[PDB]
Amino acid sequence: NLAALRSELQALRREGFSPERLAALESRLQALERRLAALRSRLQALRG
Amino acid sequence: CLAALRSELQALRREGFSPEELAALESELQALERELAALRSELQALRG
């Protein structure tokens, strides 16, 4: 679940964990979120 | 929820939707599943 990973990342930021490490992990998270949305769209287009 | 996309992909396959398009989408779904597990592990390592 990507939403759970985003919540955990933001919790670590609130808690004062390494900003540099969090920025790198968030960039990866955001890329996966975009790929997930694209996959969802293609599955919808196929279904439709 | 990657599980929701996997369930939809499998349902489209059972229902006879384009096998060639489903094969391409399943390759990306599998890649996202791997990437999510890796990111989860990195977040756990940062938390720990």
Coordinates of C-alpha atoms in Angstrom, one line a residue:
Chain A
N1 CA 0.0 0.0 0.0
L2 CA 1.6 3.2 -1.2
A3 CA -0.6 5.4 0.9
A4 CA 0.7 3.7 4.0
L5 CA 4.3 4.3 2.9
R6 CA 3.6 8.0 2.3
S7 CA 2.0 8.3 5.8
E8 CA 5.1 6.7 7.3
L9 CA 7.4 9.0 5.4
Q10 CA 5.6 12.1 6.5
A11 CA 5.6 10.7 10.1
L12 CA 9.3 10.3 10.0
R13 CA 9.6 13.9 8.7
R14 CA 7.3 15.2 11.6
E15 CA 9.6 13.3 14.0
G16 CA 12.8 14.9 12.8
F17 CA 14.4 12.1 10.9
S18 CA 17.2 12.9 8.4
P19 CA 15.8 15.4 5.9
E20 CA 18.2 14.3 3.2
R21 CA 17.3 10.7 3.5
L22 CA 13.6 11.5 3.5
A23 CA 13.9 13.7 0.4
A24 CA 15.5 10.8 -1.5
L25 CA 12.8 8.4 -0.3
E26 CA 10.0 10.8 -1.1
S27 CA 11.3 11.3 -4.7
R28 CA 11.2 7.5 -5.1
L29 CA 7.7 7.4 -3.5
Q30 CA 6.4 10.1 -5.8
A31 CA 7.7 8.3 -8.9
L32 CA 6.0 5.1 -7.8
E33 CA 2.7 7.0 -7.2
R34 CA 2.8 8.3 -10.7
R35 CA 3.6 4.9 -12.2
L36 CA 0.8 3.4 -10.1
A37 CA -1.7 6.0 -11.4
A38 CA -0.6 5.4 -15.0
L39 CA -1.1 1.6 -14.6
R40 CA -4.6 2.2 -13.0
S41 CA -5.5 4.4 -16.0
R42 CA -4.5 1.8 -18.5
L43 CA -6.5 -0.9 -16.7
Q44 CA -9.5 1.4 -16.8
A45 CA -9.0 2.1 -20.5
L46 CA -8.9 -1.6 -21.2
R47 CA -11.9 -2.3 -19.1
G48 CA -13.9 0.5 -20.7
Chain B
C1 CA -3.7 -0.8 -3.1
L2 CA -1.6 -2.8 -5.6
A3 CA -3.8 -5.7 -4.6
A4 CA -6.8 -3.9 -6.1
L5 CA -4.9 -3.5 -9.4
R6 CA -3.8 -7.1 -9.4
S7 CA -7.4 -8.3 -8.8
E8 CA -8.6 -6.1 -11.6
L9 CA -5.9 -7.3 -14.0
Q10 CA -6.7 -10.9 -13.2
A11 CA -10.4 -10.3 -13.6
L12 CA -9.8 -8.7 -17.0
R13 CA -7.8 -11.8 -17.9
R14 CA -10.5 -14.2 -16.8
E15 CA -13.0 -12.2 -18.9
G16 CA -10.9 -12.5 -22.0
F17 CA -9.6 -9.0 -22.4
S18 CA -6.5 -8.4 -24.6
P19 CA -3.9 -10.9 -23.5
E20 CA -1.1 -8.9 -25.1
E21 CA -2.1 -5.7 -23.3
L22 CA -2.6 -7.5 -20.0
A23 CA 0.9 -9.1 -20.3
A24 CA 2.5 -5.7 -20.7
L25 CA 0.5 -4.3 -17.7
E26 CA 1.4 -7.3 -15.6
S27 CA 5.1 -6.7 -16.2
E28 CA 4.7 -3.2 -14.8
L29 CA 2.5 -4.3 -11.9
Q30 CA 5.2 -6.8 -10.9
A31 CA 7.8 -4.1 -11.1
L32 CA 5.8 -1.8 -8.8
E33 CA 5.3 -4.6 -6.3
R34 CA 9.1 -5.1 -6.1
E35 CA 9.7 -1.3 -5.8
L36 CA 7.1 -1.0 -3.0
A37 CA 8.7 -3.7 -1.0
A38 CA 12.1 -2.1 -1.4
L39 CA 10.9 1.3 -0.4
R40 CA 9.0 -0.1 2.7
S41 CA 12.3 -1.8 3.8
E42 CA 14.2 1.5 3.5
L43 CA 11.5 3.3 5.5
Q44 CA 11.7 0.6 8.2
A45 CA 15.5 0.9 8.2
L46 CA 15.3 4.7 8.7
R47 CA 12.7 4.3 11.5
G48 CA 14.8 1.7 13.2

